[PDB]
Amino acid sequence: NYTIKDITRASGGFAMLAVDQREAMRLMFAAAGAKTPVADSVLTDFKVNAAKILSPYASAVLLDQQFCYRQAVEQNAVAKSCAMIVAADDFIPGNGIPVDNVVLDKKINAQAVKRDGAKALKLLVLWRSDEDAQQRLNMVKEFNELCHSNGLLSIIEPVVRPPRCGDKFDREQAIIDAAKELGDSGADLYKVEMPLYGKGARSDLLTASQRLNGHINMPWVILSSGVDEKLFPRAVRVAMEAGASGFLAGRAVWSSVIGLPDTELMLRDVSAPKLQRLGEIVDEMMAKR
Template identity: 30%
Template sequence: MMSLSVGKLRGLQQISTPDGFILLAAMDHRGGLRKLLRPDHPEAVDDQQLVDFKMDLCRALAPHASGVLLDPEFGAAQAIVTGSLPGHVGFLVALEKTGYSGGEQERRAEILPGWSVEKVKRMGASGLKLLVYYHPDAPSAAAQRELVEQVAEQCRRIDLLCVVEAISFPVDPGVSKSSPEFARTKADVVVRTAEDLTPLGMDVFKAEFPGDLRYEKDPERLLEACRRLDRASQVPWVILSEGVDYEDFAIEVEIAARAGASGYMAGRAVWKVALAEKDRARRRDILESVAAGNLAKLALVARRFGRPWHEKARPALDALARQITPTWYASYATDTSMK
């Protein structure tokens, strides 16, 4: 059962609209961003070029989002120091390092060395995002559940909003994630992932869309898959864009919203239109016009058809309200040791 505290609730309020929708612009990409900027020669993209691109992204998209998702290496502190992130816009910071360890059929996410839950809190973030690679039948599933549980517990101890993102992968050798074979199982994998992970202490679930529009065109079947995801998730949930084209993501946002999603955390689907432009000034223009327009249109869809996060979180909100008495502060934050 979902549980909220004062600090977690404040973080959730900071990354959502006043009416309760989570409409985040995701820009926490790292290693993959080098490949996107220079597919022919990713190693030629230096660190400052990554920072520059992220700062342009943040300036263009933050005004049209309820919050942003940044990474600790090239985005979060830089966005604050340069003023690229407006002070009134909430932000999440990624906890994991880019990539994964383990084999293709037993992928494992790991926390970025030198980074921690406590440091995310200390820098003033609204919350953290932990990405895990998860398939319920993978040999690594138990270890990934343990990681989620550990991070969620650390967030509970210091009252920090915890968002978990789950990325699926095929466990059968020779099957790719983009294949029709995996597409046939994807809905079940995403739903079972929600069943496994959302009871472990997270506050928001960042889920994959439980379908693949390349192979499944029936909107009713896709809607039912999203309804299954909604029933499976014990916390408010949003969908991620997985790099699909904007037009497909807009369809996914509407279907997910109709099933109970509280928004999205949108990355490449919104801003990859600007990647081909190498001139920085012209690229900024594309980000501020096309990418920002994409985000604004998605927000209209999510708010028209979706469900505010506080509806799914109502029992937790009511329980928190009952705890707030004139002497609530006396026992607040008495269990803050990190383990």
């Protein structure tokens, strides 16, 4: 039975790296001027290099079976100090985007990924105001049972989207409504979008983060999608002041080096200092408790 201590820093803070992005990462390579079509091997090589170079600074790394889990294990890319999280979400494209719908990946063999050293699984939950709450709660319950019956931690990631029908979309209220619905759903860790995209006055960001904290009844961390990499360190500090326990971040660490020459040099010189600073901020905030 793994527990939360297995994916945290010695301080108890979460300083976790995400490299599990799938077709969304292929689109990032194309947008940064990579030769199209972008081969699967370009994603695999980047993900394994990111794990190899950045996992020494992370309490856990989130890997996907589609492009990098098997390769990261076989190549010993993950530092012994860094726990493995395996994505258990099956992304369904639609309406011109890579992740229009998400279901539990029926191909994940929890016992097999546990034998390979995984300590946790992760599930994206898309949240829309006009889709049924009970279907989301049932998917989270099935996911929690898959994790807990195999001694793995469950990490859920509710992400808000506009309604299927209608034009009433308040992103800030949707994040609160998702937390009211799923913040006490029996997962081990809640991974949430940062209120206000981490923008604006620190005082308003803290108020919005404290409002969110009040609806989450498990440890929670922020993800970086939608937050400028320069504002993500402040977002971690403010979220943790509000009651968060750290971060699970991808884009705010490595997005800026996609398409630059000398990938391994760029991950070490550009990405690693950003991940190191985020880990130091987590320890500073945990020390204040």
